[PDB]
Amino acid sequence: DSIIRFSVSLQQNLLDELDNRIIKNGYSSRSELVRDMIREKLVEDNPNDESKIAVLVVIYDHHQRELNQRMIDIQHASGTHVLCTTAIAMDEHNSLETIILQGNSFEIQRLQLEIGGLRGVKFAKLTKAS
Amino acid sequence: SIIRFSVSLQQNLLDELDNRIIKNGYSSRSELVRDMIREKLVEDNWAEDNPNDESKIAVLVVIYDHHQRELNQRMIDIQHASGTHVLCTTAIAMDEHNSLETIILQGNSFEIQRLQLEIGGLRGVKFAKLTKASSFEYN
Known part of the structure; x- marks a missing residue:
């Protein structure tokens, strides 16, 4: 029955x-x-409690109203410490942002999933430097 | 949908x-x-079709020893020679010797992957990992 x-x-x-x-x-x-x-x-x-540095790469629709605010609300409410964000326009529709941050595994994973789930976010891909 | x-x-x-x-x-x-x-x-x-396309976008994340002579310049030379186009570079210090940089890149899949391989092979580079994107994800 496999x-x-x-x-x-x-x-x-x-x-x-x-x-x-x-x-x-x-x-x-x-x-x-x-x-x-x-x-x-x-x-x-x-996942563990150890602080790690990570980069989240996000591509998003820069015409989506309030999307940046929502991302900021999530970053600020997350237990991560965001070191900086850098964003550039790719084309007439999309921008790419890199978020450099530090946190434990649980906090960083949660941030990726929360951002990735927003309407207008095309993807949110995590690079972990443990 | x-x-x-x-x-x-x-x-x-x-x-x-x-x-x-x-x-x-x-x-x-x-x-x-x-x-x-x-x-x-x-x-x-990324594995297919275009040696002629230059529309791919990616992010290369690198951690390296900036005290090491010529390493920063070596990575720049490698980039200049790769044919890729750097859209933006952000750098932060993680400690006295090591920096993390995120390099936003545009180019063909070949050029971008080779850039990652070459940088990753340098003495003093502790980490070099590419985040790849494809147009079907965002177009």
């Missing part, structure tokens, strides 16, 4: 790229590709 | 997966999987 189904929810842009990759790489279903991705990513981590 | 779809897999495999959800800050299995999917699709995209 095969189960579990649901996955994808934003449409990601789902469209997944479908294109299934076609380009000769997979026969979304289920097959995702399954293989999971198998692969495993081969390729405990 | 958001479109949900079903994935089938062996319970054994699923147990390891469902195992890092609560650990990775997630509330549902999707989000570890969503991020694995994102990561893998970006890698695939």
Whole structure:
């Protein structure tokens, strides 16, 4: 009784790229590709109280009103210590921000997920320097 | 929008997966999987097509010893020669000898990855890691 189904929810842009990759790489279903991705990513981590330096890279829609304020509210309410943020415009729609910060594993993970979840944020990717 | 779809897999495999959800800050299995999917699709995209494209954007994060003679200049020379275009560099001191810099880069996937490899190989560079982005994520 070893095969189960579990649901996955994808934003449409990601789902469209997944479908294109299934076609380009000769997979026969979304289920097959995702399954293989999971198998692969495993081969390729405990959170702790130790202070670490980290960088969060965020790409966001700079026309989204109040988005910067929300990010600031999250940064200030997080237990992390943000050293600095730097932001540049990529194009007429998007900006890229790098946030350099220090905190423990729990605090930094939470910040990444809170920012990543905001409407208008295209992604929030973390680099940890432990 | 958001479109949900079903994935089938062996319970054994699923147990390891469902195992890092609560650990990775997630509330549902999707989000570890969503991020694995994102990561893998970006890698695939960077692996293909354009030796002529120069539209990729990335961030290289470096920790290095700025007391070391010529290291700062060496990293600059490497950058100048890579063909990549540096959009912005931010630097902070972590201690007396070590700085962290974030370098926002534009260029082709080849040039950017090589820049990372070359910088990472220098004496006095303690850490060099690239954050990759693909246009399907933001366009």
